[PDB]
Amino acid sequence: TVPWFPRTIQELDRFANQILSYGAELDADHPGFKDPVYRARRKQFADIAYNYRHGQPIPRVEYMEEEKKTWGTVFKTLKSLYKTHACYEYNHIFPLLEKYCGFHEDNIPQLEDVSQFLQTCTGFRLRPVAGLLSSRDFLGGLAFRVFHCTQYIRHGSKPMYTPEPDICHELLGHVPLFSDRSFAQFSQEIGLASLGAPDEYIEKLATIYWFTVEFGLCKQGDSIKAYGAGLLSSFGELQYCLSEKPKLLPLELEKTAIQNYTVTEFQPLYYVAESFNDAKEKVRNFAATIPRPFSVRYDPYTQRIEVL
Amino acid sequence: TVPWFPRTIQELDRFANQILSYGAELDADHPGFKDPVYRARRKQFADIAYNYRHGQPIPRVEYMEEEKKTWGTVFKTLKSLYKTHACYEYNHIFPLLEKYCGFHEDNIPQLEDVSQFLQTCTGFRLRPVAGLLSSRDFLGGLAFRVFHCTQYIRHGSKPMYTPEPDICHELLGHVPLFSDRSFAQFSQEIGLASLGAPDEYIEKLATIYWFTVEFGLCKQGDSIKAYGAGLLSSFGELQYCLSEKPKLLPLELEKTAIQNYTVTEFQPLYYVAESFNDAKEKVRNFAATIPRPFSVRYDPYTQRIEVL
Ligand SMILES: C[C@H](O)[C@H](O)[C@H]1CNc2nc(N)[nH]c(=O)c2N1
Numbered sequence: 168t169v170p171w172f173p174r175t176i177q178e179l180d181r182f183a184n185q186i187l188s189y190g191a192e193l194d195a196d197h198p199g200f201k202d203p204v205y206r207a208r209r210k211q212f213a214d215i216a217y218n219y220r221h222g223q224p225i226p227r228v229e230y231m232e233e234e235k236k237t238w239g240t241v242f243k244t245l246k247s248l249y250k251t252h253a254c255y256e257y258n259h260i261f262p263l264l265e266k267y268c269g270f271h272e273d274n275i276p277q278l279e280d281v282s283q284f285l286q287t288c289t290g291f292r293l294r295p296v297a298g299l300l301s302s303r304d305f306l307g308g309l310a311f312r313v314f315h316c317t318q319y320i321r322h323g324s325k326p327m328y329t330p331e332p333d334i335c336h337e338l339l340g341h342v343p344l345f346s347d348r349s350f351a352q353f354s355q356e357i358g359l360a361s362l363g364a365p366d367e368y369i370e371k372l373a374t375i376y377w378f379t380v381e382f383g384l385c386k387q388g389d390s391i392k393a394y395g396a397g398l399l400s401s402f403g404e405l406q407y408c409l410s411e412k413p414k415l416l417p418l419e420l421e422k423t424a425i426q427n428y429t430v431t432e433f434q435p436l437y438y439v440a441e442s443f444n445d446a447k448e449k450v451r452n453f454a455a456t457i458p459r460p461f462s463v464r465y466d467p468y469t470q471r472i473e474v475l
Numbered sequence: 476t477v478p479w480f481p482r483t484i485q486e487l488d489r490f491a492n493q494i495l496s497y498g499a500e501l502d503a504d505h506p507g508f509k510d511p512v513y514r515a516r517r518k519q520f521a522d523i524a525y526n527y528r529h530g531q532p533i534p535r536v537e538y539m540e541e542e543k544k545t546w547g548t549v550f551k552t553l554k555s556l557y558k559t560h561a562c563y564e565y566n567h568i569f570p571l572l573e574k575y576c577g578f579h580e581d582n583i584p585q586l587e588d589v590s591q592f593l594q595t596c597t598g599f600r601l602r603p604v605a606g607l608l609s610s611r612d613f614l615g616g617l618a619f620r621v622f623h624c625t626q627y628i629r630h631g632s633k634p635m636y637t638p639e640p641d642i643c644h645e646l647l648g649h650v651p652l653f654s655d656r657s658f659a660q661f662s663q664e665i666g667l668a669s670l671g672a673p674d675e676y677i678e679k680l681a682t683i684y685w686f687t688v689e690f691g692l693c694k695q696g697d698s699i700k701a702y703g704a705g706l707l708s709s710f711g712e713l714q715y716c717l718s719e720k721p722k723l724l725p726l727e728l729e730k731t732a733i734q735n736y737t738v739t740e741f742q743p744l745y746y747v748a749e750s751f752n753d754a755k756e757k758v759r760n761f762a763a764t765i766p767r768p769f770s771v772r773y774d775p776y777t778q779r780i781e782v783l
């Protein structure tokens with residue numbers, strides 16, 4: 168039987184409060200989670216996301232000094248690395264975010280402003296959430312060009328890497344490409360294909376998504392660049408992904424989709440795509456093979472799903 | 476050379492304040508215009524439209540007793556006539572407007588609520604204007620699914636008919652069909668085809684629009700119904716259009732487009748379409764023949780026109 172899936176933008180609110188994690192709360196390598204002050208902050212951001220409702224303007228927040236320092240450190244360090252580590256597409260968009268969206272080392276962008284910016288770029292919009300959502304829900308959101316974005320920031324003790332999708336990851340890793348017309352359309356396409364699909368196909372898509380959109384590498388001329396949002400938000404893993412430590416393999420969905428991966432440490436293996444465009448094509452083609460007893464059509468004027 | 480045309484929703488504001496009229500200010504048959512109290516009211520509604528800007532919420536207004544009585548008289552009388560005079564499509568939608576949009580004889584709908592309603596139905600939205608806009612501008616608006624709507628009401632001395640497109644005409648005549656998916660798409664299509672087109676094609680389209688969308692009649696089974704917004708808002712002309720007085724001719728664009736028409740009195744002649752659907756098809760086909768040194772594509776996610 169077919170699982171329930173949202174058919175309207177307002178319906179996405181149904182699962183908005185269903186949060187998960189990568190299970191690092193007890194990780195001795197990630198002590199930031201045990202920090203009572205840190206937890207108290209997460210609680211504050213969670214409440215905002217819990218009381219939020221579709222359409223509403225995203226509440227502006229006043230970050231603490233620690234959080235501001237973390238952002239600046241992450242920002243300035245990554246900006247330096249992007250010059251030689253990030254793919255062409257990313258580097259061409261980043262300047263625009265800095266000039267028209269307030270992306271600076273001494274300023275944490277407010278989600279409301281980023282959402283307004285994305286809307287004018289590609290119609291994508293932000294939806295604040297307490298934390299990590301399931302792959303089915305997150306992907307479902309993409310169908311309506313909605314990016315469920317966190318608002319809290321990683322613990323200041325380890326800005327180089329965090330397992331969780333904090334604001335740094337959402338803004339520096341995902342937002343840039345969501346502002347691109349082609350990538351935006353690509354994102355919505357796979358999201359549309361996931362609606363009401365069997366979980367065995369959802370998890371498979373999630374794995375493919377992980378090895379491409381999240382931690383993917385691609386050839387650019389005779390060099391290798393990073394385009395995965397998880398690499399682009401971690402100055403620690405960004406250095407590593409192009410070093411001699413990790414293992415590299417050609418991107419092949421049949422193998423990639425069944426490949427194992429870590430969610431609390433640097434990836435031991437990465438898949439290299441012939442090009443950033445070939446990656447999108449490959450993932451798009453697989454998404455179209457996801458079987459289901461029906462077809463879907465999205466009407467942007469009413470923002471509703473049509474089941475055919 | 477190609478005339479300027481809006482490429483974004485915000486750009487529509489450029490001509491928003493350019494108002495016209497059907498030149499009845501000196502008509503001895505329409506003395507309501509000379510009424511100083513009436514003029515003072517028009518001035519009030521005009522200022523609201525003049526200070527309005529894209530995106531902004533449409534200001535709510537408090538109508539006077541006279542205006543409320545006029546609406547009730549127009550509403551109750553037309554509702555009675557629709558049962559036997561209005562096309563099937565219209566009568567099927569009207570009930571919904573009454574139940575979900577506040578269309579009642581003892582209540583003049585606020586444009587903000589109507590706009591919100593239309594948006595959920597087909598994505599169409601209202602844009603308050605001081606009065607009659609040129610055909611080029613009005614049609615241009617349709618390209619972005621924007622209906623420039625008046626907010627003032629006809630003079631209470633003659634509720635049966637008015638040359639101007641008052642709120643009664645906008646709400647009772649146009650809104651109903653704009654809430655229909657198929658008609659909405661039809662409207663946007665012709666609007667898209669008008670952008671930057673030579674005026675000789677614009678005026679020709681306007682004439683066709685006048686004899687169909689505004690004062691068109693269509694066969695429904697073995698009977699004849701009215702679907703034109705101008706007939707549906709005038710209980711005076713609604714009675715007349717199906718009487719023995721007017722002259723009827725089969726809808727034929729080649730002749731219709733070059734046919735003369737009045738803008739201050741009941742139409743002496745009407746064109747009958749084989750069906751409400753055939754009318755849409757005919758007008759859509761003609762619109763597609765409008766020549767121009769370029770093609771246009773509308774992106775609903777960014778609400779911008781793409782010149783190809
Ligand atoms: C689809 C894939 O699982 C991806 O990693 C999703 C999972 N859930 C998420 N949840 C939130 N709030 N933010 C994200 O960026 C993601 N990433």
Ligand SMILES: C[C@H](O)[C@H](O)[C@H]1CNc2nc(N)[nH]c(=O)c2N1
Nearest residue numbers: 604606607608610613623640681
């Ligand atoms: C396109 C055709 O000219 C049509 O009659 C337009 C003209 N201008 C208009 N202007 C306003 N404000 N409202 C209308 O309904 C119309 N109708």
Ligand SMILES: CCCC[C@H](N)C(=O)O
Nearest residue numbers: 328329332336397400401
């Ligand atoms: C899926 C979230 C990945 C987050 C990434 N490890 C970072 O530190 O930004």
Ligand SMILES: CCCC[C@H](N)C(=O)O
Nearest residue numbers: 636637640644705708709
């Ligand atoms: C084009 C406006 C037509 C208005 C119509 N004559 C009416 O009285 O409602």
Ligand SMILES: [Fe+2]
Nearest residue numbers: 332381396397
């Ligand atoms: Fe991510």
Ligand SMILES: [Fe+2]
Nearest residue numbers: 640689704705
């Ligand atoms: Fe009209």
